[PDB]
Design a protein around this ligand. Structure first.
Ligand SMILES: *[C@@H]1O[C@H](CO)[C@@H](O[C@H]2O[C@H](CO)[C@@H](O)[C@H](O)[C@H]2NC(C)=O)[C@H](O)[C@H]1NC(C)=O
Ligand SMILES: *[C@H]1O[C@H](CO)[C@@H](O[C@H]2O[C@H](CO)[C@@H](O)[C@H](O)[C@H]2NC(C)=O)[C@H](O)[C@H]1NC(C)=O
Lengths: 145, 272, 148
C-alpha cells in the first residue's frame, strides 16, 4: 500500500471543483446515505466509514450526461475511487449499516461532502500511507441507534 | 462660499406660492440648476436670483450657486397630484458607472413610501442594486448592461398611488462605436475563368446594424448570416462564385453601420 | 408598432449553444423545484403560449438560474438575461385584468425547468425568423379562455 501515498492529487481535485462551480444553486435537495458526525467523532474513522458511501455516491448520484466534461470528471473521479480500495483496510463489519444515516440536502452540500473526503484523504495519505490502516471497531461500536 | 436666501438645506412650499432664490455674493456668481423654463433669472451685481410667481412641482430640485470668479439649496414643491418631478426621461451610462434616475420626490414626507419598478407593476431585477436619494431620485451604482430598461417611480400612500412616466435607461459595456469589419481575403487574383469566394463580416455588441458587400458602387445581393458568439453579434455576407467573368473583377467594399456610424473596408479582385 | 426586422436575429445559435452547455453540465437529480409557468392545459395556442411565457421566462432566469459569479454558466445566464430584455421590443403587451391568467405553479426537476427555458428560446427564435411581426398578435381571446 505504498503507491497509495501518491494516489489522489490536484489533477482531479480541481476537476471536482469545476464540477461544483458549474452547478445551479436551486432549492433542490436530494436524499442520500452518508456518515452521521452525530455518532462519529474520530476523523480517522470518518474517512473510513465514508469510503464505501462515497463510492456509492460517485456511482449512483453523481450522474452527468455522457462524454461531457463533468461526465469525464466523474469517470476519473471513479477510477480513483476504485484504485483507492488499495489503501483502506476493511474492519469488523457486523451491524453493517452502523454509523450511517440518510441525508436530505442540496446537491451543493453532497458534492462538498465528496469534496472534503478526497481532501482529508489526499491529506492524511500524504502524511502517511499506512493511515486508513487503523482499526475502527472501537469507533463504530460507539454509533448508537 | 456664497450665501443663499431664503436659506438653509431644504425649502418646502405649497404650489402657486411665489419663491425667490437669492444668491448673496460679491459681484458675479452663477446658478447651476435643474431649471428652465420654469424659473426666471436675473444675474446682476449682488449675485443672481431665481424667481417664480407660481411654484409648481416642476420647480422641485437642487439649486447650486457658485462663485463665478459653492452653496446649495434643494426645493420641494409639495403637490399631491404629483409626487414626482422628472428631470429627464432617458439616461445613458457606461458599465460599472453610477446611474441616476432623476425621479425627484416632491414631498419629504413621502421619503418612506417610495419604490423603484419596471413597467406593468413588475419588480426590478434582483441583480439590480440601487437605493433612494430624496434629492436625486433612485440610483443604480455600478450599472450592468442588464439593468438597461424602462423604470417607473411609485409612491403608494394608503391606497393612493402616484407613478412617474417611464425613464428609459441604457447601459453600454463600452462606448458605442461603428461595427468592426473583416474582408477575407484582403486581396485576391484567382483568375481562372472560374472558382472564387469573398467573405465580408461585421461585429457589434447589439443586433441593430447592417452589413453589405459591394463591387465598385454596386451593392450585391447576398443572403445574410447572423449569430451571437462571445458577447457580440456577427453578420456575414459571403460571396460565392463558380466561374468568374471580367465584370466580377474590381474593388469590393464591406460596409457596416449602426446608430453611431459606418465602417468600411476595401479589397481588390483581379482576373485576366 | 415596435418590433423591428432585427428581431429575426436577436436570438442566435450561440445563445442556444451556450444554454445547452449550461444544461449539459447540470447533474441529473432527483429533485423538484417550484416555479411559475403556463399550463398548456389552459393555453394551447402556440404564439400566445410564448407571449405569455416571455415574462415568466424572464423571471425564471432572474430568480432561479443562480450560478457563482464569473462562472461560465453565470456569464451565459447573464447573456440570456440580456437577451430577454432586448426581446421586449418584440412582444406587444396584451390586455387582461387577471394578470395571473393562464399561469400555474409547477413542481419539476431543474433540468426540466431549463428545458422549458430552452424550448422558449428555440420556438421564439424559429417564429421570429419566419416573421418578426409575429408576437404582435392580439392574444386577448386566448387568455380569456384560461380558467381557474
Ligand atoms: C469680495 O470681498 C472679498 C473680501 O473683501 C474680496 O477679496 C479681496 O480681499 C481683500 C480686499 O480687497 C484683498 O486684499 C484680496 O486680494 C481679495 N481676496 C482674494 C485673494 O481674492 C473680493 O475681491 C470681493 N469680490 C469681488 C471680486 O468683488
Ligand atoms: C400659475 O398656475 C395656476 C394653476 O395652473 C394658475 O391658475 C390659473 O389657471 C389659468 C391659467 O392662468 C387661469 O385661467 C386662471 O385665472 C387661474 N385659475 C383660476 C380659475 O383661479 C395661475 O394663474 C398661474 N399663475 C399666474 C401668475 O398666472
Amino acid at each position: 500500500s505504498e503507491h497509495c501515498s501518491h494516489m489522489i492529487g490536484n489533477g482531479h481535485l480541481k476537476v471536482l471543483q469545476q464540477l461544483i462551480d458549474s452547478q445551479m444553486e436551486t432549492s433542490c435537495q436530494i436524499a442520500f446515505e452518508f456518515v452521521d458526525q452525530e455518532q462519529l467523532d474520530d476523523p480517522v474513522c470518518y474517512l473510513k466509514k465514508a469510503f464505501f458511501l462515497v463510492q456509492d455516491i460517485i456511482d449512483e448520484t453523481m450522474r452527468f450526461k455522457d462524454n461531457t466534461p463533468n461526465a469525464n470528471a466523474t469517470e476519473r473521479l471513479q477510477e480513483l475511487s476504485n484504485n483507492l480500495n488499495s489503501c483502506f483496510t476493511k474492519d469488523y463489519e457486523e451491524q453493517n449499516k452502523a454509523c450511517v444515516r440518510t441525508f436530505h440536502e442540496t446537491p451543493l452540500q453532497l458534492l462538498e461532502k465528496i469534496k472534503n473526503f478526497f481532501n482529508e484523504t489526499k491529506n492524511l495519505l500524504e502524511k502517511d500511507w499506512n493511515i486508513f490502516t487503523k482499526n475502527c471497531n472501537n469507533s463504530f461500536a460507539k454509533c448508537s441507534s | 462660499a456664497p450665501v443663499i436666501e431664503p436659506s438653509g438645506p431644504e425649502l418646502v412650499v405649497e404650489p402657486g406660492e411665489t419663491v425667490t432664490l437669492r444668491c448673496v455674493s460679491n459681484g458675479s456668481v452663477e446658478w447651476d440648476g435643474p431649471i428652465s423654463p420654469y424659473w426666471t433669472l436675473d444675474p446682476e451685481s449682488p449675485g443672481s436670483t431665481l424667481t417664480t410667481r407660481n411654484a409648481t412641482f416642476k420647480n422641485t430640485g437642487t439649486y447650486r450657486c457658485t462663485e463665478l470668479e459653492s452653496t446649495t439649496i434643494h426645493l420641494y414643491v409639495k403637490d399631491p397630484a404629483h409626487s414626482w418631478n422628472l428631470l429627464a426621461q432617458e439616461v445613458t451610462v457606461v458599465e460599472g458607472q453610477e446611474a441616476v434616475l432623476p425621479c425627484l420626490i416632491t414631498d419629504p414626507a413621502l421619503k418612506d413610501s417610495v419604490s423603484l419598478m419596471r413597467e406593468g407593476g413588475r419588480q426590478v431585477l434582483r441583480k439590480t442594486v440601487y437605493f433612494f436619494s430624496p434629492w436625486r431620485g433612485f440610483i443604480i451604482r455600478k450599472a450592468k448592461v442588464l439593468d438597461s430598461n424602462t423604470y417607473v417611480c411609485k409612491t403608494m400612500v394608503n391606497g393612493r398611488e402616484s407613478t412617474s412616466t417611464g425613464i428609459w435607461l441604457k447601459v453600454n459595456r463600452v462606448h458605442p462605436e461603428p461595427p468592426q469589419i473583416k474582408l477575407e481575403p484582403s486581396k485576391l487574383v484567382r483568375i481562372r475563368g472560374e472558382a472564387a469566394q469573398i467573405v465580408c463580416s461585421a461585429t457589434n455588441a447589439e443586433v441593430g446594424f447592417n452589413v453589405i458587400l459591394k463591387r465598385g458602387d454596386t451593392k450585391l445581393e447576398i443572403p445574410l448570416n447572423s449569430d451571437f458568439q462571445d458577447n457580440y453579434y456577427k453578420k456575414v455576407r459571403a460571396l460565392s462564385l463558380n466561374a468568374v467573368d471580367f465584370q466580377d473583377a474590381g474593388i469590393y467594399s464591406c460596409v457596416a453601420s449602426n446608430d453611431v456610424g459606418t465602417r468600411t473596408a476595401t479589397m481588390n479582385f483581379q482576373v485576366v
